[PDB]
Structures are given as structure tokens and as C-alpha cells.
Design an enzyme around this catalytic site. Structure first.
Site, mmCIF file in Angstrom:
data_model
loop_
_atom_site.group_PDB
_atom_site.id
_atom_site.type_symbol
_atom_site.label_atom_id
_atom_site.label_comp_id
_atom_site.label_asym_id
_atom_site.label_seq_id
_atom_site.Cartn_x
_atom_site.Cartn_y
_atom_site.Cartn_z
ATOM 1 N N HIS A 61 0.852 -1.190 0.000
ATOM 2 C CA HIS A 61 0.000 0.000 0.000
ATOM 3 C C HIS A 61 0.890 1.243 0.000
ATOM 4 O O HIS A 61 0.569 2.265 -0.612
ATOM 5 C CB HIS A 61 -0.891 0.003 1.245
ATOM 6 C CG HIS A 61 -1.654 -1.271 1.438
ATOM 7 N ND1 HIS A 61 -2.612 -1.705 0.546
ATOM 8 C CD2 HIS A 61 -1.594 -2.206 2.413
ATOM 9 C CE1 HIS A 61 -3.110 -2.855 0.965
ATOM 10 N NE2 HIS A 61 -2.510 -3.182 2.095
ATOM 11 N N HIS A 91 5.308 6.850 7.003
ATOM 12 C CA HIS A 91 5.150 6.440 5.620
ATOM 13 C C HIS A 91 4.625 7.646 4.871
ATOM 14 O O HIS A 91 4.353 8.688 5.474
ATOM 15 C CB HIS A 91 4.124 5.314 5.508
ATOM 16 C CG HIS A 91 2.772 5.689 6.032
ATOM 17 N ND1 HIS A 91 2.431 5.564 7.362
ATOM 18 C CD2 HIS A 91 1.705 6.260 5.423
ATOM 19 C CE1 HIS A 91 1.214 6.044 7.550
ATOM 20 N NE2 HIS A 91 0.752 6.474 6.389
ATOM 21 N N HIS A 93 2.131 9.096 1.271
ATOM 22 C CA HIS A 93 1.044 8.893 0.327
ATOM 23 C C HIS A 93 1.454 9.833 -0.803
ATOM 24 O O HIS A 93 1.803 10.987 -0.547
ATOM 25 C CB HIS A 93 -0.291 9.334 0.926
ATOM 26 C CG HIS A 93 -0.746 8.482 2.069
ATOM 27 N ND1 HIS A 93 -1.454 7.311 1.892
ATOM 28 C CD2 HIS A 93 -0.570 8.617 3.404
ATOM 29 C CE1 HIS A 93 -1.697 6.766 3.070
ATOM 30 N NE2 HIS A 93 -1.171 7.537 4.005
ATOM 31 N N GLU A 103 -3.295 13.556 1.091
ATOM 32 C CA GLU A 103 -4.617 13.115 1.506
ATOM 33 C C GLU A 103 -5.365 14.335 2.035
ATOM 34 O O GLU A 103 -6.483 14.621 1.607
ATOM 35 C CB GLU A 103 -4.490 12.013 2.557
ATOM 36 C CG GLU A 103 -3.770 10.786 1.995
ATOM 37 C CD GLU A 103 -4.053 9.519 2.773
ATOM 38 O OE1 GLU A 103 -3.818 9.507 3.995
ATOM 39 O OE2 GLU A 103 -4.510 8.533 2.155
ATOM 40 N N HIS A 116 3.279 10.822 6.956
ATOM 41 C CA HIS A 116 2.526 10.513 8.160
ATOM 42 C C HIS A 116 3.420 9.847 9.188
ATOM 43 O O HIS A 116 3.913 8.743 8.963
ATOM 44 C CB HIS A 116 1.355 9.577 7.834
ATOM 45 C CG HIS A 116 0.233 10.251 7.107
ATOM 46 N ND1 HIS A 116 -0.776 9.551 6.481
ATOM 47 C CD2 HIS A 116 -0.043 11.560 6.919
ATOM 48 C CE1 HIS A 116 -1.626 10.404 5.937
ATOM 49 N NE2 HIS A 116 -1.207 11.630 6.190
ATOM 50 N N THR A 195 -6.430 6.743 7.633
ATOM 51 C CA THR A 195 -6.902 7.035 6.280
ATOM 52 C C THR A 195 -6.879 5.785 5.412
ATOM 53 O O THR A 195 -7.216 5.833 4.226
ATOM 54 C CB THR A 195 -6.057 8.111 5.596
ATOM 55 O OG1 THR A 195 -4.712 7.642 5.440
ATOM 56 C CG2 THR A 195 -6.077 9.395 6.415
HETATM 57 O O1 A09 Z 1 -3.874 7.238 8.904
HETATM 58 S S1 A09 Z 1 -2.508 6.860 8.676
HETATM 59 O O2 A09 Z 1 -1.464 7.781 9.035
HETATM 60 N N1 A09 Z 1 -2.336 6.524 7.079
HETATM 61 O O3 A09 Z 1 -3.409 5.726 6.606
HETATM 62 C C1 A09 Z 1 -2.197 5.412 9.616
HETATM 63 C C2 A09 Z 1 -1.780 4.222 8.969
HETATM 64 C C3 A09 Z 1 -1.532 3.080 9.756
HETATM 65 C C4 A09 Z 1 -1.692 3.121 11.143
HETATM 66 C C5 A09 Z 1 -2.104 4.301 11.774
HETATM 67 C C6 A09 Z 1 -2.360 5.464 11.021
HETATM 68 ZN ZN ZN Z 2 -0.940 7.535 6.076
#
Ligand code: A09
Ligand code: ZN
Ligand code: A09
Ligand code: A09
Ligand code: A09
Length: 256
Positions: A61, A91, A93, A103, A116, A195
Site C-alpha cells: 500500500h 510512511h 502517500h 490526503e 505521516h 486514512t
Molecule cells: O492514517 S494513517 O497515518 N495513514 O493511513 C495510519 C496508517 C496506519 C496506522 C495508523 C495510522
Molecule cells: Zn498515512
């Protein structure tokens, strides 16, 4: 399973994850003229001086840089937060084009990507128990715009060809996440959710106003990653962002 294709993308998630149509879903468009400065907000404290990265993984992903969270090594405190939140991973996006990828949006403006940094509330013991609480997580979001290269991101960029496909991981120690932060910590905050599925509504979002600039070459390497696993038809890992969701009964606060 869920993804970002036409048949398993954001518009399909609700069938397996009903909360996708919940009351505090993320991301959201940040309307700067509706957000209000909140004097009750305490100074934000990003303490990453003792951070211990362990490895980087392509989960099909996006790619996660994981940290050792068995102790308060890298934490986030202050701002709208109560207590201490431990960094567990970060990570990004991103899009297929420079004009899309983030996002969250600001006055409908989309950035090329969004970083993030995920943290969990230490009073819940572990990430698993934290995602069962309304204040279990805190994610620091940072926008990326294309321009000058970001020195502190190159280490991440150069290891990507070793984790091209889903399931691949590689050692990634001694990486300093402080090199990914902008000069200013001015931010907007609101109650939201993950998200990505399971889309759990346990996140206090802290989105920085100042984006960091990355070079075209750096983002181009993000786009060479694969959603697929080794040996399968190649599907480029691009546009792995969820679009803005209904703000509903929520207020976005500004720290400035
Ligand atoms: O909301 S996120 O930052 N991205 O989808 C997230 C991802 C995995 C675990 C917690 C938060
Ligand atoms: Zn994220
Ligand atoms: O995860 S989902 O998007 N939920 O509907 C999905 C879509 C098609 C097939 C499996 C899962
Ligand atoms: O979910 S992850 O980012 N990849 O497995 C993770 C990071 C640190 C500890 C557990 C899980
Ligand atoms: O909304 S998405 O599924 N993920 O960002 C998407 C897929 C292809 C092109 C734009 C957006």
C-alpha cells in the site's frame, strides 16, 4: 483485498469497513478561513533525538519505516495532546503526478505527497490496545511539494529499489526523522481516523502548515515502487491517497 484500484479503491472500502462512512473520518479538506486559532493549545513538542529506526517495509500500500517503540525514544507531546505518544512508524502517500498525492488538502489544494508519522498513546500499553480508544493515536502529517531536494529524505529514496515489491523489507537503522521536518511547527488539528482500512477513528491529527520541499527526482523514485508482489504483473505504486472526507460535526483548530 483493499487497495487503490478501480475495484478495490476508496469508494469500495465501506463494504468491508462500514466505518468508512463514519462521523470522524480522515483525511479532510482544511478550510483555512474556517479553522480558528485556539489559545488553549499547548506548545507542540517533537522529541526525536533518541529515535531508533529498525527497517523499511513495502506492505503493498506504501512503505513503512519502523521504529523501536519499546521505550520512550521518539515521542510527541503537547499541542492538543494529553500525555505521551510514541512514534511507531512513518510512511507517505503520493500521486502519479506532481499535482496530486496528499490526503489532506488546504483550501482544496493538493500537494505532491504527504508524510505521516504515526504515534500511539503510551497510557494504552501497545498500538493494538491504542486503536480501540478515541485518543489512542496521534499522526503528524507533513505536506511535500516539488522543488528543491530534501537532503534528509535521500537515505529513504536510495533504499527503495531494495523493497520494490509487496512483502519486501530491508534493514533501515540510524535514520533521523528530524530531517523530514519543516522549520515551523505551526499546525491545524482535528479529531479523525486512519486514512487506510480499518479506518479506525482513534486519531488526533496534527497537520503542519509549512510543507517540506522534495525534488522531482526524489518523488520519481517513490513512483517506481510496486503495489504487486515479486513475479506478478507490475502495477506501479502511485496514487495511494484517500480523498477528502466529510468534516461533519467537527472543528479544525489552528495553533497560530
Ligand atoms: O492514517 S494513517 O497515518 N495513514 O493511513 C495510519 C496508517 C496506519 C496506522 C495508523 C495510522
Ligand atoms: Zn498515512
Ligand atoms: O476492501 S474492499 O475495497 N472492500 O469492499 C474490497 C473490494 C473488492 C474485493 C475485496 C475487497
Ligand atoms: O505496522 S508496521 O509499521 N510494519 O509491520 C510496525 C512497526 C513497528 C512495530 C510493529 C509494526
Ligand atoms: O483515489 S485513488 O484510488 N487513490 O489516490 C486514485 C487512483 C487513481 C488516480 C487517482 C486517484
Amino acid at each position: 483485498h483493499w487497495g487503490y484500484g478501480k475495484h478495490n479503491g476508496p469508494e469500495h472500502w465501506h463494504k468491508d469497513f462500514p466505518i468508512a462512512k463514519g462521523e470522524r473520518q480522515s483525511p479532510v479538506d482544511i478550510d483555512t478561513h474556517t479553522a480558528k486559532y485556539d489559545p488553549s493549545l499547548k506548545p507542540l513538542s517533537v522529541s526525536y533525538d533518541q529515535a531508533t529506526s529498525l527497517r523499511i517495509l513495502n506492505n503493498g500500500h506504501a512503505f513503512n519505516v519502523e521504529f523501536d517503540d519499546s521505550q520512550d525514544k521518539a515521542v510527541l507531546k503537547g499541542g492538543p495532546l494529553d500525555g505521551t505518544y510514541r512514534l511507531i512508524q512513518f510512511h507517505f502517500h503520493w500521486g502519479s503526478l506532481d499535482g496530486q498525492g496528499s490526503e489532506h488538502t488546504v483550501d482544496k489544494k493538493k500537494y505532491a505527497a504527504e508524510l505521516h508519522l504515526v504515534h500511539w498513546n503510551t497510557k494504552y500499553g501497545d498500538f493494538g490496545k491504542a486503536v480501540q480508544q478515541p485518543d489512542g493515536l496521534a499522526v503528524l502529517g507533513i505536506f511535500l511539494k516539488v522543488g528543491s531536494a530534501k537532503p534528509g529524505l535521500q537515505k529513504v529514496v536510495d533504499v527503495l529499489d531494495s523493497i520494490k515489491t509487496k512483502g519486501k523489507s530491508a534493514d533501515f537503522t540510524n535514520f533521523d526523522p528530524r530531517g523530514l521536518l519543516p522549520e515551523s511547527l505551526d499546525y491545524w488539528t482535528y479529531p479523525g481516523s486512519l486514512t487506510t482500512p480499518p479506518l479506525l477513528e482513534c486519531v488526533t491529527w496534527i497537520v503542519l502548515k509549512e510543507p517540506i520541499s522534495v525534488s522531482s527526482e526524489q518523488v520519481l523514485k517513490f513512483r517506481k515502487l510496486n503495489f504487486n508482489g515479486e513475479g506478478e504483473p507490475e502495477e506501479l505504486m502511485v496514487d495511494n491517497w484517500r480523498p477528502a472526507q466529510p468534516l461533519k460535526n467537527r472543528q479544525i483548530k489552528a495553533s497560530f
